[PDB]
Symmetry: C3
Subunit: 492 residues, 3 copies
Amino acid sequence: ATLCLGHHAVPNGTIVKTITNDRIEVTNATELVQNSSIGEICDSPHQILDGENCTLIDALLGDPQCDGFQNKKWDLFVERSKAYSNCYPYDVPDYASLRSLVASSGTLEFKNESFNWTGVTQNGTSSACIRGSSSSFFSRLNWLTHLNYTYPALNVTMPNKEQFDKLYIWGVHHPGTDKDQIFLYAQSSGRITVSTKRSQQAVIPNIGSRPRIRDIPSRISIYWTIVKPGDILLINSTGNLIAPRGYFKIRSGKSSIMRSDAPIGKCKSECITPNGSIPNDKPFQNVNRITYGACPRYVKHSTLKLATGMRNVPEKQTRGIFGAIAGFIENGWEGMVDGWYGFRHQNSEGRGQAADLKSTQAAIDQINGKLNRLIGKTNEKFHQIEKEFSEVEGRVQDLEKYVEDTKIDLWSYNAELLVALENQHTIDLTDSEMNKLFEKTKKQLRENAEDMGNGCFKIYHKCDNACIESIRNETYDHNVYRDEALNNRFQI
Amino acid sequence: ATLCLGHHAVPNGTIVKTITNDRIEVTNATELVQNSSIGEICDSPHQILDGENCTLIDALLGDPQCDGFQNKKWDLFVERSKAYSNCYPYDVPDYASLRSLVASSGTLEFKNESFNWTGVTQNGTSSACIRGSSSSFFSRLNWLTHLNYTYPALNVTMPNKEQFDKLYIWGVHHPGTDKDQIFLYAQSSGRITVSTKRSQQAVIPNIGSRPRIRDIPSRISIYWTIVKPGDILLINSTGNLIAPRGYFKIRSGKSSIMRSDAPIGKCKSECITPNGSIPNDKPFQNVNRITYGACPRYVKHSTLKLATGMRNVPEKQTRGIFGAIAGFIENGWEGMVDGWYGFRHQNSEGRGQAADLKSTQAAIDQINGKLNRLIGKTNEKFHQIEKEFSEVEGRVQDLEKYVEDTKIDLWSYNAELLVALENQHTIDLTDSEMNKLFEKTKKQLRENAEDMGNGCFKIYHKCDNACIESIRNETYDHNVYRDEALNNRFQI
Amino acid sequence: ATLCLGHHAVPNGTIVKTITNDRIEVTNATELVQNSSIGEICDSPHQILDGENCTLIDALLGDPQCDGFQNKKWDLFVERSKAYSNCYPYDVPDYASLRSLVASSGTLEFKNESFNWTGVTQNGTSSACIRGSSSSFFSRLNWLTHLNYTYPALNVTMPNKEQFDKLYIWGVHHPGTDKDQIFLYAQSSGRITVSTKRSQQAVIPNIGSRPRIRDIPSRISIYWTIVKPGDILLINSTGNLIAPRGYFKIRSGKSSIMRSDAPIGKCKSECITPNGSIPNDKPFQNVNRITYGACPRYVKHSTLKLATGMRNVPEKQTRGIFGAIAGFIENGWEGMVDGWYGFRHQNSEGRGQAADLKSTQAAIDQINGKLNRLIGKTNEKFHQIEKEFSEVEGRVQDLEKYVEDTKIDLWSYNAELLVALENQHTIDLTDSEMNKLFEKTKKQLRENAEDMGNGCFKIYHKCDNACIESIRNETYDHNVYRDEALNNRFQI
């Protein structure tokens, strides 16, 4: 009789990369790079705040347009490119740091405080910042002006006797004329100094016309102070002070901000990009280097195929290290669809085929053990650094860019090497399981059969279907057939 | 006779991770993550300076409390959380950069210089800074005041004609009243400008009361200049100048600073953390991301087990690639305690067991070669970046945090992959050595024995203890027994 | 007859590192670290601009010495250590950021603009900046002075109505005396404020003598503004303004700057270091961490040898996992120079040797597949961060240094692990190909030969040269000789 060992093959193989070859065909493979988004930022499970027409800073200051954002919290604040300011013209020195610390804090929770502004006119107001069809101002800021043509020197204190840090936002007004300076504050100069036990911020206003923003040549420069428990805010002003009305609560947590024009969708996804939410089943992604949540790692490769099956073809230069698959076994069997390894036989009762379940399962379990290491195990990242920039800044920006490029190149290397190593090992382990099955079958047959060199055994006795079945299921008694087999082997 | 090949096993195995399995038991394993400190910073072999009640900046300025730190050097300066300043109230713009450059320099070596302060009163003194029960000041700073109610415009020069850089520390006094400004300096304003060939630092004092620190509403702002050889320091002051008394030597080397409340111990250890000194035998550590010296690399894993022995069990899905261990050899032998591989026999004279030394050693040497790559080869790091922060700063701090998080995640990946790869290879190499021993034994026996399929050979002749011994030690002559063996094999 | 399987060896082996051994000899190996430069910066294929005696900033401002650099472009600007400024003394706040953004832009393209300087004297000039033997000034800057002893308040505007960004360079003059201030500008103070819609830069000059640079105690402080399309530059000055004569075009691209004293050579090389251009065939380099172009990655190792051949020696502790090379095959054959694996025979007609081409090629193809992954696949880097520093700066510099050290250590790890893994696999794959050839030969011979245990087969029949040739080329019919062979094997 004849008993042949073999493995399965498929008509639709997949090309993968290995350590020793750029292009080898395997029976099956899975993609490890996520390359697509559905185009929507899912509203679950992270608390999304669409900024819509407002930036985070405008919502913080209290632009009238952003009145509905009062005391809001978020996991992720989404800034739109269409956003525009429509209150008094302002600048923030170190705007990026203020935007970052508020975004990381994740709250616009504001508590009003009763400051003693004796001797000055409160609630100053402008036609550049109209609220409910009336001239107004930033909701969190108090513009102070002269009362009875006098602005006395202010020396106003507020202690932090709480158990949490207080974030104070205040500003300095720069009029476009000496005339407006006199009209507003009486005083010719003006000067603002705010202090804590640990800090001093001293600002001297600059009178002068700047290019008009929405017809306004004057500006407000915005500053912030953090006052910890047991510390005290102290505000000296001889004019030009845009006063705080209280403090923001500042928290620490997982909160962040992202620039994106993707719509908010009614859906659930853990990983957010500016292109929209992405699946996180895969370990790597090519969609965006800017991410929030439990996200695949950004890599530069567009595709990385992990082999999830054996080799599909013979090829000498990538043949497994044991030399069975693509080796002494000439080809796989497309007609074996119930297992990865198996037996074909020819006897007196005909020709048959049967899969080996134990070797098939042993190969599958090893491949699944690789998949369990790589699939569905992404790591959470929240507030990070900015990675896209609208203006030239030089040295700090060069550093932020370099850090991200360095990180991406290292992760792109890790991903490439991982796939090449795993694929080489997957091809070698599947070759190994075939070789083990052949060796086990050979030992079983003892002196009753000879290797024909092609994965087939010439069995030197009469072996019916039950006899072939006994070999396949490990119950073959060689002693039963040994005399018949030895006579047939050793003759003339 | 019967001769069986086998391997050792133990009752107390250890679970490790591989490429293809999350949980596999091996005979032995070693821990690669250091997770503990003894709680003391060892005083050897690095030169430790305990700052005790003083910060590095207070010791630099010459707070009276820190007079014993004059001209000290260190490899590592240790700042305590209990530390407090008890001289005149001061701030430093870019305090972190000054603290860093002094810490990296590693010396408080100070050389006095004779500045020409003609026309002003020297050695100004305060009740806020008492030394030996007398009102005093910072030991390295010279407070200048009016003489005869006049403060002439100063224009004082000092050349660097040395061969080393000079670090000058100076300050600006901000009085809390215009009255104190007049009393001290005569002049209503005051102004300080210090220059080199390459730099200018122009400071305008700010008169005004700040929140009181130890009853003092006024402040001194501290600045520094570095003057290189062939350059010149030039100091213009029309008042408010806190003058230097000389320069600090500035060096480059391995020096650093660390925040820690761990006691200094009388001991010797190369790696220092804020939690105390740690062993550096292991390649990785989980104790602290802040380190100094020849230290294991910080990783996020709490444990990483490297297999140092073979597989302890049979398991089909992780059976070695050669298929002997956990394969056709059903189980290991707990009663073999003199070697990792060996022989068991049954003959006419009884049953015995003996270890194979050459295969045992070949496996051990390979595992030791892995250990030699990983154990006791840590790399020295000294002055780095700060990694814990007491205040919100925004953009720069976001970057410093991101750089460290990026580095830790990459090293944590390297450590995880290394263990999984090495463990897979260790299991495969130990399976290989077993297979090689079996194959070598098979070839030795020629036609005188048959494989029974379980790692045992049925020897078809009479083989006494000396005959079994000859097989084990490679002196078996097959030709001697061939006729006897062939007759027994090939019969009816 | 006797047929022996074997492999080649060489007299001049090369030591490599593996996973399990520090020192193993292989037949051949290639170097993966580039350690040398030819000492010249090649002028091709990147556009080189030698700055010679000029810095990039001096060429930008228009030092007379740098007049030949007007409107130049470059891929790489080369600054020399011999470079020196010979116009009016200047400083740049954030000099490093300005130098960086211009270097990255890669162009000195300048367009003159007609500013309305009504009421002031234009084209101010100095003996500190002589051009063609006449007193002059920076070519891109316009020094404004009083006209008729009056300096009216300037309020000068320039819109960007183009489609590209404009880079404006301007300055502030600080006279060394109040007298020179009056002589030049009439006004006692002077003040400069330049604004856009988005920015304000307000500079107050500081009257005062600094240490003389080439006999000059006064200074010009340089500032820059970028004005985007639809934005407007606005310049207010009441004195001391060093005016722009137009704008620089600003671009984005692959341009950079490098400090180097290496000569420019007439040659072609893609990778530039400060030490000179380097070959980029190798994946790693030890020459410099500062690079430009398609460059090998900087690593700390001086040498890394990748094995490109099999093991050259027997050694038990690193013997391949199949146990043929350095195993049951006692040694290689130095006399086999036509292939890596082969046959030696002894028969009735003599003794011979012949190489196996198919196994030799299979090993070579796998090794070449590794080489194709590592050789000639370097990645392009252009403008990065600075990595060498001439002055102490503290925190930002600590961060830039830490980022680079972190990156180098990670790449140095990747390179070390790659070589150790590849070399282990190369030794194992070459052992595998030897084992496959032996196993294939064994199956071919069937019952006509016996393994002697040393890679040699005892063939139990008369096998002439044509019979040996038939075995080597896969046409051996075992059935022809089986009766003769069985009689000789199984006798007394």
